[PDB]
């Protein structure tokens, strides 16, 4: 329950800055 359990339920717990998390962070990295 460490990992696809507990990051299940924090994706709408800011609802308004996860919606946009990643659409407020793309760039080009490439890494």
Same mark, same amino acid.
């Given at each position: 329950? &460490?990992?696809? %359990?507990? =990051? &299940? %339920?924090? =994706?709408?717990? =800011?609802?308004? $800055?996860? %919606? =946009? $998390? %990643? &659409?407020? +962070? +793309?760039?080009?990295?490439?890494?």
């Amino acid at each position: 329950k &460490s990992y696809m %359990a507990y =990051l &299940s %339920a924090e =994706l709408f717990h =800011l609802s308004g $800055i996860m %919606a =946009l $998390i %990643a &659409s407020g +962070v +793309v760039m080009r990295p490439k890494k």
